[PDB]
Design a protein around this nucleic acid. Structure first.
Ligand SMILES: *C[C@@](*)(O)[C@H](CCCNC(N)=[NH2+])NC(=O)[C@@H]1CCCN1C(=O)[C@H](N)Cc1ccccc1
Ligand SMILES: CC(=O)N[C@@H]1[C@@H](O)[C@H](O)[C@@H](CO)O[C@H]1O
Ligand code: NA
Ligand code: NA
Lengths: 251, 26
DNA sequence: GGTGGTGTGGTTGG
DNA sequence: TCCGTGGTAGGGCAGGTTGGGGTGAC
């Protein structure tokens, strides 16, 4: 997260850390959606142009954390994965279309002050909130500049951007399965996600019912926080039926 | 079920330091 | 230490 | 007005964990 700040404690209790068992390293963000399911970006697990293909036993997830590296005793939860599900239409070659994955945990997790699921959006919420100019919020332990990593969880708020602007900003083919967010160069304020923040949630607070909803997954970018350049996020409401099916089919 | 309502924020009616920024954006 | 600290609370025991 | 038949990829032209529907994109 570039140009953000430290998170308050419990500020993002659905934030999840995707960890590799060996070497013990942080791969990505992710998010807690049920007591058995975590949602990340597919490229965190599978990215064939670099021969990345992580098994269920390659990884852990860590929930409830704030410190990046330190074991947060009686606060965090470490869970082993039962099964990984990647979207069948995930396009690793061209544009990271449908950059989304679900990981089933070996056992259900107990919620707490620090560990708590975020909501996925319904149609009405989504229609209402996915509008250019509205700000949402991105969190992660990814990098602070583009050329190092944060002591604790970083948060930043950024506005959703009109699709024609997003389309003109990048060379890459963009699908309606992805949206972009960020400030424009003449808006003054700055901020972005960066490497390591993939799978982390782009979220919005519903003025209608006070709940936080996950509208996006941190997917990709070109640099981090470059003028004219915007962070790209997996459009979560577009892929919600896949999420539903998988859960209901394999829970 | 319970989703979206943070124990240390919404369940106490306590706001985080930057959430208004979002709400003013609507 | 187990997981940092010229540490003994903290977002948590002792 | 269009959004499947290979593609990220099997087997096949339907459908699945997937070809819907969208701050659509052409
Ligand atoms: C995997 C995530 O950690 C990472 C997040 C980058 C987000 N950056 C900003 N500025 N919001 N994703 C990536 O790095 C993705 C994965 C692999 C390549 N990639 C890129 O961002 C490339 N820079 C752009 C790109 C290359 C190939 C295909 C799609 C996008
Ligand atoms: C695209 C790719 O490499 N996918 C592989 C899959 O073929 C295999 O069944 C699994 C176990 O090795 O790892 C993953
Ligand atoms: Na201690
Ligand atoms: Na097919």
């Amino acid at each position: 997260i570039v140009e953000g700040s430290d998170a308050e404690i419990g500020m993002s209790p659905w934030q999840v850390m995707l960890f590799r068992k060996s070497p013990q390293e942080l791969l990505c963000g992710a998010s807690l959606i049920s007591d058995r399911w975590v949602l990340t970006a597919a490229h965190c697990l599978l990215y064939p142009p670099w021969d990345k293909n992580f098994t269920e036993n390659d990884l852990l997830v860590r929930i409830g954390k704030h410190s990046r590296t330190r074991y947060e005793r009686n606060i965090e939860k470490i869970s082993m994965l039962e099964k990984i599900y990647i979207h069948p239409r995930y396009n690793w070659r061209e544009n990271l279309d449908r950059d989304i994955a679900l990981m089933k945990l070996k056992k259900p997790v107990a919620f707490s002050d620090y560990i708590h699921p975020v909501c996925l959006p319904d149609r009405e919420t989504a229609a209402s909130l996915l509008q250019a100019g509205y700000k949402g919020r991105v969190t992660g332990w990814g990098n602070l500049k583009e050329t190092g990593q944060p002591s604790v969880l970083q948060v930043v708020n950024l506005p959703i951007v009109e699709r024609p602007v997003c389309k003109d900003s990048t060379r890459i083919r963009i699908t309606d399965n992805m949206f972009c967010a960020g400030y424009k160069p003449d808006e003054g304020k700055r901020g972005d996600a960066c490497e390591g923040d993939s799978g982390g949630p782009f979220v919005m607070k519903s003025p209608f019912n006070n709940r936080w909803y996950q509208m996006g997954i941190v997917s990709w970018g070109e640099g981090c926080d470059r003028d004219g350049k915007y962070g790209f996020y997996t459009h979560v409401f577009r892929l919600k039926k896949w999420i539903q099916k998988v859960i209901d089919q394999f829970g | 079920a319970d989703c979206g309502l943070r124990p240390l924020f919404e369940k106490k009616s306590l706001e985080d330091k930057t959430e208004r920024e979002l709400l003013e954006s609507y």
